[PDB]
Paper text:
In addition, alanine substitution of residue K95 of HigBTAC, which possibly corresponds to the active site residue R81 of E. coli RelE29, fully inhibited toxicity in vivo in M. smegmatis. Note that the [name] substitution that leads to the inactive toxin was used as non-toxic HigBTAC control for further in vivo and in vitro analysis. In parallel, the crystal structure of isolated monomeric HigBTAC[[name]] was obtained at a 1.9 Å resolution and used to compare possible conformational changes that may occur upon association with the ribosome. Notably, these regions include most of the proposed catalytic residues of HigBTAC (i.e., E66, R68, N73, K95, F93, Q98, and K99), suggesting that such differences could have some functional significance. In support of this, the structure of HigBTAC clearly differs from the alpha-fold models of HigB2 and HigB3 in particular in the two loops between β2-β3 and β4-α3, which contain most of the catalytic residues.
Numbering used by the authors: 8 to 127
The structure:
């Protein structure tokens, strides 16, 4: 169901940074976000669920909970790579989160390559 999703870590060996962030969220929100991540791959999201943020960064938003839970990610070839997961109060995704996302994309691309290897 989660297909080609990846989860930000700083190195092939490093701390599972995205998962530690994700895991702190409430059960109901974690379950809802997994469903959105699965649907993202199928192509059947409603318009409230996916927003372009800046550059290559995209946002999954849990619409049924006033977009209070979100995942920033980017497409690394055919693999969406989850960069940060967070609770948010305002509709405007905060600057700090977007900077973290941009920073983690650069970190990822530097450690693992700008695009996936042709064979995994």
């Amino acid at each position: 169901a989660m297909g080609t999703w990846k989860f930000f870590r700083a190195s092939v060996d490093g701390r599972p940074v995205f998962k530690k962030e994700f895991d702190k969220l409430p059960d109901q929100a974690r379950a809802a976000l997994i469903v959105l991540m699965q649907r993202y791959l199928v192509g059947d999201l409603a318009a409230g669920s996916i927003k372009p943020i800046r550059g290559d960064i995209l946002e999954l938003r849990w619409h049924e909970a006033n977009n209070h839970f979100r995942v920033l990610f980017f497409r690394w070839g055919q693999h969406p790579v989850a960069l940060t997961a967070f609770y948010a109060n305002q509709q405007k995704t905060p600057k700090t989160k977007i900077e973290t996302a941009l920073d983690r994309q650069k970190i990822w691309k530097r450690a693992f390559g700008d695009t996936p290897p042709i064979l995994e």
